[PDB]
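The following block was generated as part of the benchmark described in Methods. Ligand: nicotinamide-adenine-dinucleotide.
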Amino acid sequence: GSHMVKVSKFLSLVLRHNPALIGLDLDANGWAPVKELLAKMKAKGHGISMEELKHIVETNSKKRFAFSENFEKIRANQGHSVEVDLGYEKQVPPAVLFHGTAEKNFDLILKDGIKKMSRHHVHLSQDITTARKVGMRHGKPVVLSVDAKGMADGGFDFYLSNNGVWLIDFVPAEFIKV
Ligand SMILES: NC(=O)c1ccc[n+]([C@@H]2O[C@H](COP(=O)([O-])OP(=O)(O)OC[C@H]3O[C@@H](n4cnc5c(N)ncnc54)[C@H](O)[C@@H]3O)[C@@H](O)[C@H]2O)c1
């Protein structure tokens, strides 16, 4: 018994999708009690102890798991893995999204579009006032709002980070409406 690699696969299924296999109990913070996890999945035919599951979470190295102080609670960080999982929850996606930017880099951003200037980068403005507010950072602002039509039709699903900001994978400026 004790298939370490299978416990990890099974883990990512149980605490991250469907805890009901082993009877895992999920927190509001998206954590699961390890103590439950190894105990309940032990009964599920895994035969691992706390540190053996700690060994699974020790193989978290692909940035898909994490453990606590006593190691008594784990979170599998992953899901809507844009990066990993720090603020990419599939929430209510707006089709039309505003984005404040500034005028000299307006020429730049309307020429190139709000795109990869970092890995998975395009956070647009959730409100017109914030849009214009952030544009003022370089000097003169311009609001660049992508037309819902182009993006909804384009099959883009959007996601939001913790600040309630509207993210898209990439907005070519042709979809952007100045
Ligand atoms: N304040 C916060 O904590 C927070 C958190 C998440 C998102 N946001 C959002 O981010 C925006 C505010 O700016 P920021 O936080 O990204 O700061 P930032 O300092 O990263 O600003 C980057 C600037 O470069 C511009 N830019 C992006 N692509 C460009 C391109 N291809 N060519 C030329 N210029 C380009 C951006 O429009 C912006 O003017 C708003 O939409 C805001 O809602 C703010």
